[PDB]
Structure formats: structure tokens, C-alpha cells
């Protein structure tokens, strides 16, 4: 990321093992479940382009996410290109780190006024990421009905972490009969604590 | 969180890798457990809307319990609206929980003097939220923590203030077994735990 | 705890996560034997009152010890507001504890001049509840601690001051075994451990 | 890697036990897998050659892939010696990999004014070295990835550009080819998109 | 341990959770092997009285091996005592130990000038304790090592070295018979490198 | 290791539980392969005598080795003595009689007298003993078995040469005769990488 040294100028403080590790491991253990987005702007925190590059290119498998996250990235770089035309001002494929050194990067962020090329790359990843959450999610909200023996606590669980990856009253459609029945009965506008409570 | 750099501005410091695993494995362990909201606290010290967010963002299952959560959230952003009408800006309570707020303006009005701690007022809905939460997913009603025939009376006070806290002092002596709750009233009235516990040893 | 910024005004630091997690896990492991106390002390170095009941609340289970210690804190701070009588403010019992008192206050009085110590005068009252604790949950008396026929000594002198802890020096040679009293004796009035543990070997 | 003191003068900052054994433990269990190599620049942040070295030297195994690296390193070095014939001294080859030159000289060249940043040169060359041994390492061809009868399409494209990205090294037809080697039933259906779709569309389609 | 503030004096640093973790393990651990000891005075370095006796009171067994440690301590502040008599206070033996002495009192003496290095001296009477307690502790005498029949003589040399730790000619002694013989052959005055290529 | 206060003068840092830890871990799990030199020399990057004392001390098991290394360092201290007949000593460098403040005194002196590189060199030269000793199979029992593959036996054959010009063609030699033939074929002066690809 971005620090000011004792001498006065502004240079790139090394990303750290923390770091490195960190994301590499959820990535790991968590592939791209909606969790991993939010960790990773997390640790991705005041990073420069060289650094988001950095950490995407840490992970190891799932090479078709990132080839899709690489497209994401080419067209929102494109569409940068379109509305900021060349008359220096930094262009789509500065912003994306593959025509733009260290010095520059930290150059456009450090500047007064700050252009955040890293905050600004950070959205088009993001945005990318998530187009690959929503795909990678492998059950519909549809498919999502409570089982005849299973809580309503459980099944209220399943229902929002589908809901999450991709409403109120077809989560009442979804419950078995019993449930459903004493759902109903609670009438419109009511509460997920409510319904929760009156199914337990 | 928040920081004042060596420029004297004041600008988000980023929250830590520690602190971000920190909560989500007390999640994963502890699940909505009462000693998790302490921890929230703790781990959420001096964070903005948005870093109060994140810590929530990284939570990933329990998302009944989460989406309980956002109510709650959502009812107290309308009743700060109620109380704080519209006429650097006033923070509406989209603002507070970050929905409608940039980190520059929520940086802007804790660090603001006057300080208007956004911060610690989202914090304030996020734990009430939370409570709730610990309060459903509390399984036993104080009144079935009955004392077992061969149960030790320290085990059961541990069972009996465990339920206590996730949902008086005279009940804990009613519903103790008939050998220990004969012992206990002989020690007559107001009488400490300590003197209590000692007794039926 | 706490740390003056560049701007001069002291202000909170944050708990650290590394002392968040050290305490609770001390408290899972250890429970409440003797050594848990020296390092709640050393893990709540500069705490706050604010800080104390963090610390307290990531506590999970152990809640009949837990109330004993709100007892013990509700005794001290009644003892402080009948020495300290109402008459920056100044500090009552429950403001010490940390129940009816912000954290800015918290700061005043320890970072004032001259310096009121809230946090440790409340470190004072807690550690003196959690021995109380530590003394009641030991299970075993020193008198009943006795050297066993094959028993070493240097595991029954371990028994012994363990015990002793929790809860003298001519003792530990009355309640010797046979073979090891009669070389102890024998070694005369005023002898080091050292010297004991060396002859019963 | 590198810091200024209090004293005012640049000094070597020794590199840290989580920087040691976070590059000893990937290699250990990725060995030479292309992710090894952003991570390897990555600890290896700011290091003069002789913390290169010293990185390089915690690697345990592997010797017959660190032997390759030497030459790598010789080679580069050879290279640089005749673009820059000897005429604080100038660095020659030898002096940038280390073996000929003092951490001091090392500390001089790159906290020098103009600097000469030895280090990034040396990694330079180290991580062209890491990349022919991925390339060697990588056990199939581009060619040989051809989806399974009842394989996810899904499934294919990441065994597609994981070959990609070892044969490459990292390093950027091969978008038409990803069609041609689809199994005939995701074929068809690709084909039907039409010339130009992007990845997402694609794997979409076939899901 | 000891540091000096942004506003001049010097003031106590809080003992690190590392270091309080990284003490009470060692002697879960290891108790008190001889390797334990170099570690306390490792981790307790820069320590304040106050500080010595935090890390000795976070050990949580051994209390007969923590009680002679007492008794050395009791004894070596006596010493002190009868050597410095009482005529900022000059410190006596108690307050050397942190019994009678409060902690600006403690950083007072070490940080005063001309120093004196109440932490310093305390370790070395904790250290000469510890020492005494690895000594008895200590297993096996050095005269019961023998090298077994079918034992290499490097694991024995281990054994050998290890005893003589926790407590020459001797270790040519109590090999067995075949090695004794090719030891015997090298003559007097050989290094224990030429020895152990010997019986390989 | 070695530090400047915020008083000016240069002063003694406590070394690291982290690298304490580092080096006991490291020795415990690689006991004397030949990838654990070079990290002790990391570790105990800018120590001073006593520090280095404190890594090796720190170490439980392998005293044979450990009292090999004292030799190698009794023998280095006597050749230093013999050439350099306050000033330090050969005694004073492994840290046996001379006191910490003395040890930062000659390192931190100007000119530096550099203690702690000098004693890092005697035992890392003792080191390599041990590590060329613990070796267990010699370079010319390296031979290429009949199915094994050619990159397996090259991380075998460089691996012995690692713990123990001529070499490379030697290499040649004890591969099997199928490869045998194929790398003679290449001619001389061929590349590790074309001896590789050619046998794959
Ligand atoms: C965590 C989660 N589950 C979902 C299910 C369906 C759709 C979206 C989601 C989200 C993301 C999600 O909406 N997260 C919340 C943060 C949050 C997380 C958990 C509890 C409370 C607040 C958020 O980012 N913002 C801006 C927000 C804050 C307050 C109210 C409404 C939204
Ligand atoms: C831990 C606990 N058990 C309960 C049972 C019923 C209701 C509430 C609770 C609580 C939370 C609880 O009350 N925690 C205490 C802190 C505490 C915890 C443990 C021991 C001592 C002090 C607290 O937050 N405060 C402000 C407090 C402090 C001292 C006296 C009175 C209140
Ligand atoms: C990860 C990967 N797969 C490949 C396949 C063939 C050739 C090269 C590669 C690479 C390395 C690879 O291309 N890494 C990317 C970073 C990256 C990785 C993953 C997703 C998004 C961005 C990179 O270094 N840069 C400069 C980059 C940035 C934006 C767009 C395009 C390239
Ligand atoms: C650990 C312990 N065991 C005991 C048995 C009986 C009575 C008290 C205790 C204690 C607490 C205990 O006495 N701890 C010691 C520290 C200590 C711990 C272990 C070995 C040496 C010194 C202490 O806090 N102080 C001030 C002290 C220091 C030196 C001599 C006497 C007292
Ligand atoms: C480690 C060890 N093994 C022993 C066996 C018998 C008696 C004492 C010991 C010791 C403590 C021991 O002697 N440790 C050594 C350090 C050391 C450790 C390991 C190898 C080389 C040097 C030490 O502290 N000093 C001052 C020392 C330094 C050089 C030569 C001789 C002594
Ligand atoms: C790692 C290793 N294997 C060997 C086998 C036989 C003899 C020596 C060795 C060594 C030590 C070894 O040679 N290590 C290398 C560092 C290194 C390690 C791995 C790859 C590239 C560079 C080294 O220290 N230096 C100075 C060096 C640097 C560049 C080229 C040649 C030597
Ligand atoms: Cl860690």
C-alpha cells in the first residue's frame, strides 16, 4: 500500500506476509463465496494498483474466475478510456497497473488533488468478483424449501446465504405446511423475528 | 478505524488483518454466544460505518440471524430520521449505517468538532440487533434450569446464571434439589453466593 | 488502554486482538487457577474501566464466578462512595466500575493532574474478587495434603505449595511420610528446601 | 531489504522471521507453481541481492530447479557484463548477484543518488530463472486440454487457462482454441453465440 | 520491561502478550530442561523487577521447583543486604526482588544515572535459582550413560552431552567395547569431530 | 541485536520472540540439513556474541553437534589470539569474558570492529562441519536407477552435493544408460535445462 517516509515524500510501503497469507487462504479455504469480497477489499486496504495486481495474482487455481475477472476489468478500463478522453492524466490501462509504473500510481494518489487510481481498480474488481459470486452460486432461491423435519431457523439460514450469493413473502411460500400454516396466521407485514419466534 | 496522519488530516487506518480474523472466527466458534457481543465491541473499537460493515460483511453463514440484524438496523435508522429532520451536511440514519454516506463524510463527522460519532451510534444499533439475536438463539427459559438429584450445586449456578445472561436471586434457591434447597434456607435470608456454594460442597 | 496522540490530547487505544484472545484463552485453559490472576493483571496493563469489563464480558462461561465478582465489585464501590462523599467531576463507585461513566471521563480522571487511577483502583476490587474466587474453587485443604507411603517428595512438596496458593514451613515436615519425616528431622531446625528435597531423593 | 536509521545514513534492515518462513513454507507446498512466483516478489520486496540470496538459499529441496536457476543467473549476469564494460565503483555482473560484493556496496548502489537498484535488476533476472522452471515444471500441453464428455464447462475453462498460465509463465488465437477444444454438445452452443462473446456469456451459455 | 515516552521520562512498557504466551509454553513444554533457562532470559530481557516476578508468577505447576526458587532469592537478597548497608533511596535486597519496592521506583534505579541495574541483578539471582533447580531435576548422573551394544556412538555422544548439560576421558570410558577400541587407537588429545568419523 | 535510542547512544535490543522461536522450530524439524545455515544467519542477522549465544543455547537436542561446534569455535578464538596479540580477543568474540555493553561497544565503535560478524563467521564454519558430517550418502553412490526419472535424480544428486566443474560431467556419468546415451549425444557444454528437456 501507501506511506509518507521521514524524508518527506510519499512511497510505497511493501505489502505485508499478514497480507499476503491472509487473502491467499480464503481464497483457499472459502473459493468465492460472498464473504471473500468484502475480506478482500478489507485487506486490499489503501492498496496502489501494482499491489491489487499483486494479490490477485497470489491466487492459484480458479483461472476461469480470474479470466473472467480479467474481461470485467478490460471493459471497465475501456469504458474509463471513453469517458476520460487523452489532451499526465492517467488512462483505463494505467488505472488496471499494465501501463503505469510504482511512481506513477503512487504519483495520481499521493497527488493533491487525489485521482485514486487504487480506490477506482478496487471498484472494477470488485464489481468483477461479484459477477463471479452471483455465477458460482449453485442453488436458486426456488430451490430453496424447507424439508419436513427441518427447523425454520435452518431453513431461514439456507434461505438468505442463497438470497446473498444471487423475497420476504416467498421465503413464507418456501416453509412446509406446518410452518406455513402458523406463518399465515401471523398475517401481513410481519417480522423475521416474529415468524422465527412463532416456529420454534 | 480512524487516525490523524503526520499531514494532521484525519484519515482512515485501515482495518487490521488480526482484527478481521479475529471476528470471523469467534463467529465461527462461538456463534451468537452472549460472550461474542463484548468481543464485537472490543474488535470494532474506534471503526467507522463503513469498517462496521465490513466486519459484518465477513460473517458468512448465520444469515437469518444477519438479515434479523438489518432490521433492526433499519428500524433505528428510521426513528434517528423521526428525531433528526433535514433542513458539511446532517447525517440522516442511511448515513449512519453507511448506506448513504461516503468514508470521507462518516470521517467527517466523528472527527468533526463538535464530534457527531456516527460510529459509535451505528455501533450502539448493531449491538442492540445483536442482543436480540443472542436472546432467540438462547435455548433454555430460566425456569426449566432445575437442579438434578446427584447434579453439584456449582455446576447448576453455572447452568442457572449461563441462562440468566443469555435471556431472581430467590429462584436460584427454589428450583436447587430438595437436599442442597433444605441447607440453603437454613442459611436464611440474604445470603451470598459465596456463603450458598460453600455450604452445599 | 491508553496513549496520548501527536495532537497532545490523550485518547483510547484500542485493545489489542493478541490481548483480546490471550485472556480467553488463559480462562478456557487455566479456568481460575492461581497463575490466571498474575496474567489478567498483566493482560489488562493500563486498562480502563471500560477495558476491565471488556475483558471480563469476552468471558464465556464460569458466570457463578463471574456474579460472585459483580458482588465483590458492588461491595468495593459502596465502600468508595461512603470514604468519597458527593459534594470534571468527582469520581463515585459506580463511575470507577465503569456503569455510570463514559470513556472520555474514564480518561479525565486517569490522565487529569493529579492523576485519579480509576482503572487501577477498579483493577484493585476486581483482582480482589478473583481471589476469592481462586480460594473458593480450591478443591483440596492444606491440612489434608500428606505424603503418600510411595510417594516422592518432590511431589508431595509440589501438592503442598500448590495448595498452599490457592488458599507452614514446620508443617510441610509433620505431614511427611514416615522414612522421609525421620531424615528430615534429622537434618535439624532452620533447614532450606533445597537441603530437604536433597536428603528425601 | 532496506532502511534509513536514525542516524540519517541508509542501513540494511535484516530480513524478518514472517518473510523467511512465509517463502519457506509456499515453496514447500507449491513448489514451483505459477503463484509461487508474484508471491516470491512480493517477500521478496525491497531485499538487496544478498537477501535475495538468502531467500533462495532457506529453499531446501528442489535443487535440480535451483541448479537451472544459477545458470539463469550466470547467464543474465554474462549479459550484463557486456553491455557494461568496466571503464563508488561501477557494478559489474558478479557484483549484482552477490557473489562479488559487499552488503555495504549493495546498500551504496540502490540508496545512491542517481540509484542503481541492484536488487530489482537481480530479481529481474531470478524471476525470469523461476519462469523457465515453471514452464518446464508445467506437466501438460495448451493443446492437450479438451473437455470430457460429462465434464462442467465450468471445470474445463479452469484446467484451459491454469495450462495457459504455466506454458506462459504469467506472461500474456489461444480465445478461439478454448472453443475448438469444448466437448461437441458446449460446442455447438458456443459456436451459436457467435465471434467476439466474452467468458462470462459463454460459460453462461454451457451451464 | 523499560521505555522512554514521546514527553521525555521513561516509563514502563506493558509486557507483551507474546512474550507472557511465549514463557508460560516453554515451561509447559519443556519444565526445566537446561535449554529453558537461555529462553527466560531471552524473553525477560530488558525486565523490571515487577516484570521478573509477572513471569514467574504466570508459571502455573512446579510450585515445589517455584518454592526453592524462593528460597535462592530469600538467600541472595540477604547476601546483598549484609554487602550494601542502609546509611533517591539506595536499594536493599528487597527491593531488588520487588517485594518492598513500587515500579517508578524500579524504573527510578535502572533508568537513573549512574545506573543501577535492579532488573539485571534480580535475573542473575533467578537464573543461579533456576540453575539449581535444573541441576536437581536433572534425570540420569553422568556415570550411568554407557553406550549400549547396538547404540551408535553419535546417539550416545547425545546422551552423553545432554547429562553433562543439566549436571572427556570419561566418554571414551563408557563406550562400548568395539568403538572403545578404535577410540583407544586414535590416542590421547582427539577432538570429538575425529572420534565420531571414527566409530561411524 | 543492535539498536540506536531516542538518547543517542547505541544500546542493546531484545531479541525477538518471534525469531527465538524461528530458530528452536526450525532446528527442531530440519535438525542440521544444509537449508538450515542460512537461515540462522538470517536470524541472527546484526546479533551481537551474546545473542548468538543465546540462538545456540536455545537449541534442546543434538549437544554431539553443539559440543563439535564448541571446538570449532575454541580452535577459531586460539588462531585469532595467535594473529592479534580495549582489544578484543579471541574470548571476547564468542562472548565468554566480555560483558554486553563491551560487545555493542566494539560493534557500534567507530571504526567498527565487528564482533558479531566475526563470531557469525566461526560458527557458521563450525556449522558446515556438522551439517558435512550428518551428510548421510556420498555424491558417487548417486547413481540414476532404471525407472527413475531424470529430474528426480538430479534433485538427488545436487541435493549430496549440496551437504558435502568435475561435477557436472560426473553428473553424466551415474545417469542410466538410456539417458546416458541421450545426454552424450547433446555434446559438451550443454545446459542443465537441454540435459532436462532432453531426458523428459
Ligand atoms: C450480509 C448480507 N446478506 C444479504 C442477503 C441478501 C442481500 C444482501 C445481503 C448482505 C450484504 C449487506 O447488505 N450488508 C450490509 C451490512 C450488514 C451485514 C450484515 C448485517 C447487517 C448489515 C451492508 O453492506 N450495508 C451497506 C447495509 C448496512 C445496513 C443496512 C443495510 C445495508
Ligand atoms: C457477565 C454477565 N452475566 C450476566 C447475568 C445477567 C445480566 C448481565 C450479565 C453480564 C454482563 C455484565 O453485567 N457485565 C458487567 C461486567 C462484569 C462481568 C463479569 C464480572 C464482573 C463484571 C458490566 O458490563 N458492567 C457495566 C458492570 C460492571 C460491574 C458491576 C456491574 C456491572
Ligand atoms: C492469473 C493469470 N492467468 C494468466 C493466463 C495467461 C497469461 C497470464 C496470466 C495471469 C497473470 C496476469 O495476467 N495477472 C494480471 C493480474 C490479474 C490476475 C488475475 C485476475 C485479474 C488480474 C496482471 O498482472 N496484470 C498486470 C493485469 C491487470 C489487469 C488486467 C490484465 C492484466
Ligand atoms: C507463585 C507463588 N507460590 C506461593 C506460595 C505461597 C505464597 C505465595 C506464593 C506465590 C506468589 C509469590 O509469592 N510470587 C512472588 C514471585 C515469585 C514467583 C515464583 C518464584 C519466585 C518468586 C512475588 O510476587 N514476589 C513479590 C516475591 C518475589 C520474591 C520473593 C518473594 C516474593
Ligand atoms: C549448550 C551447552 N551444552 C553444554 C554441555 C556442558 C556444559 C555446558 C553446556 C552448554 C552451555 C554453553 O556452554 N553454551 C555456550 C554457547 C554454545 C552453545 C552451543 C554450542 C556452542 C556454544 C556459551 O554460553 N558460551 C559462553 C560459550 C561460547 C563459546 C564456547 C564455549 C562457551
Ligand atoms: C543452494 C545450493 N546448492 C548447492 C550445491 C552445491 C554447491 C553450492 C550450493 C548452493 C549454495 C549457493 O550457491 N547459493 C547461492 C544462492 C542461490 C541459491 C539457489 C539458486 C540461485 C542462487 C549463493 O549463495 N550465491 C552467492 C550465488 C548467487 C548466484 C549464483 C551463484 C551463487
Ligand atoms: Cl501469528
Given at each position: 500500500?501507501?506511506?509518507?517516509?521521514?524524508?518527506?515524500?510519499?512511497?510505497?510501503?511493501?505489502?505485508s506476509?499478514?497480507?499476503?497469507?491472509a487473502?491467499?487462504?480464503?481464497?483457499?479455504?472459502?473459493?468465492?463465496?460472498?464473504?471473500?469480497?468484502?475480506?478482500?477489499?478489507?485487506?486490499?486496504?489503501?492498496?496502489?494498483?501494482?499491489?491489487?495486481?499483486?494479490?490477485?495474482?497470489?491466487?492459484?487455481?480458479?483461472?476461469?474466475?480470474?479470466?473472467?475477472?480479467?474481461?470485467?476489468?478490460?471493459?471497465?478500463?475501456?469504458?474509463?478510456?471513453?469517458?476520460?478522453?487523452?489532451?499526465?492524466?492517467?488512462?483505463?490501462?494505467?488505472?488496471?497497473?499494465?501501463?503505469?509504473?510504482?511512481?506513477?500510481?503512487?504519483?495520481?494518489?499521493?497527488?493533491?488533488?487525489?485521482?485514486?487510481?487504487?480506490?477506482?481498480?478496487?471498484?472494477?474488481?470488485?464489481?468483477?468478483?461479484?459477477k463471479?459470486?452471483?455465477?458460482?452460486?449453485?442453488?436458486?432461491?426456488?430451490?430453496?424449501?424447507?424439508?419436513?423435519?427441518?427447523?425454520?431457523?435452518?431453513?431461514?439460514?439456507?434461505?438468505?446465504?442463497?438470497?446473498?450469493?444471487e423475497?420476504?413473502?416467498?421465503?413464507?411460500?418456501?416453509?412446509?405446511?406446518?410452518?406455513?400454516?402458523?406463518?399465515?396466521?401471523?398475517?401481513?407485514?410481519?417480522?423475521?423475528?416474529?415468524?422465527?419466534?412463532?416456529?420454534?
Amino acid at each position: 500500500p501507501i506511506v509518507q517516509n521521514l524524508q518527506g515524500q510519499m512511497v510505497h510501503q511493501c505489502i505485508s506476509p499478514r497480507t499476503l497469507n491472509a487473502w491467499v487462504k480464503v481464497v483457499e479455504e472459502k473459493a468465492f463465496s460472498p464473504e471473500v469480497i468484502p475480506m478482500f477489499s478489507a485487506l486490499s486496504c489503501g492498496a496502489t494498483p501494482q499491489d491489487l495486481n499483486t494479490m490477485l495474482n497470489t491466487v492459484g487455481g480458479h483461472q476461469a474466475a480470474m479470466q473472467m475477472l480479467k474481461e470485467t476489468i478490460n471493459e471497465e478500463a475501456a469504458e474509463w478510456d471513453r469517458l476520460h478522453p487523452v489532451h499526465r492524466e492517467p488512462r483505463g490501462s494505467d488505472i488496471a497497473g499494465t501501463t503505469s509504473t510504482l511512481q506513477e500510481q503512487i504519483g495520481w494518489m499521493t497527488h493533491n488533488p487525489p485521482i485514486p487510481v487504487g480506490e477506482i481498480y478496487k471498484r472494477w474488481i470488485i464489481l468483477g468478483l461479484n459477477k463471479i459470486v452471483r455465477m458460482y452460486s449453485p442453488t436458486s432461491i426456488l430451490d430453496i424449501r424447507q424439508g419436513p423435519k427441518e427447523p425454520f431457523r435452518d431453513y431461514v439460514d439456507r434461505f438468505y446465504k442463497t438470497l446473498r450469493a444471487e423475497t420476504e413473502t416467498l421465503l413464507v411460500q418456501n416453509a412446509n405446511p406446518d410452518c406455513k400454516t402458523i406463518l399465515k396466521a401471523l398475517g401481513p407485514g410481519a417480522t423475521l423475528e416474529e415468524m422465527m419466534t412463532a416456529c420454534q
